[PDB]
């Protein structure tokens, strides 16, 4: 079977069944949009009703711009450019969401392959709340 | 059988394994995967090997964990594999001061489990969370 054959990954090898695993149960919401800004993929690691940014199986192979609200369009575009371009290699954003109690940290970052070349974007958001909460006396 | 390059499903959407490798690479983190046999079979590649937290070799991969640690390091990684595979706890964290990379390291060991609940092994991700502590101030 093909998902279960150990293909190299990284400095080892993984199936398919324990990549998949893995980004699943990273403590991200992962989200990634292929060069031709298709968005292909969010992983499934967060509960729906804990998620800060909806995503719907609707939006996956739709272009990026159907993941953000349009007066936003203009931020979105301006980031993929500089990624695309090699002006940055990561944008980052952070902001308290109330609603889930959630310090939010954004990463987008330019996927390049080895030779540098521009292969997509990845984007990664994070609660950092709990790395401000690491001395407890409870 | 799948090549490497072609589309297959992944979380909520599709990826290549070629695109999940990258993308298991430009995460911010270092991640080791132990499966349920004991065998460590991966590492990313997301920093040089001389700047990693926890240096890991190719030598190590296909290794069982056993070998991968000195005796008094090892006791402890024991310890912490019963609890993740027994479902008391679905991670353990522990952070310090790396005054050497300039990093103030958070790490966590979690239970890769299936949708059944069952186990599929360890999953280790380190990440320098000393660059979070400036955004107490937002």
């Given at each position: 079977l093909d998902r279960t054959t150990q293909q190299p990954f990284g400095n080892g090898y993984?199936?398919?069944?324990?990549?998949?695993?893995?980004?699943?149960?990273?403590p991200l919401e992962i989200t990634f949009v292929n060069k031709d800004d298709i968005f292909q993929y969010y992983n499934d690691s967060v509960p729906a009703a804990e998620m800060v940014f909806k995503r719907t199986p609707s939006q996956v192979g739709r272009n990026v711009e159907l993941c953000h609200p349009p007066k936003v369009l203009d931020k979105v575009k301006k980031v993929f450019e500089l990624?695309?371009?090699?002006?940055?290699?990561?944008?980052?954003?952070?902001f308290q969401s109330e609603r889930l109690g959630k310090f939010v940290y954004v990463t987008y970052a330019a996927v390049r392959d080895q030779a540098g070349?521009?292969?997509?974007?990845?984007?990664?958001?994070?609660?950092?709340?709990?790395?401000?909460?690491?001395?407890?006396?409870?």
């Open positions: 993984l199936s398919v069944e324990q990549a998949n695993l893995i980004l699943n149960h990273l990624l695309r371009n090699g002006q940055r290699d990561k944008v980052n954003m952070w070349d521009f292969q997509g974007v990845l984007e990664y958001v994070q609660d950092i709340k709990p790395f401000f909460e690491l001395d407890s006396e409870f």
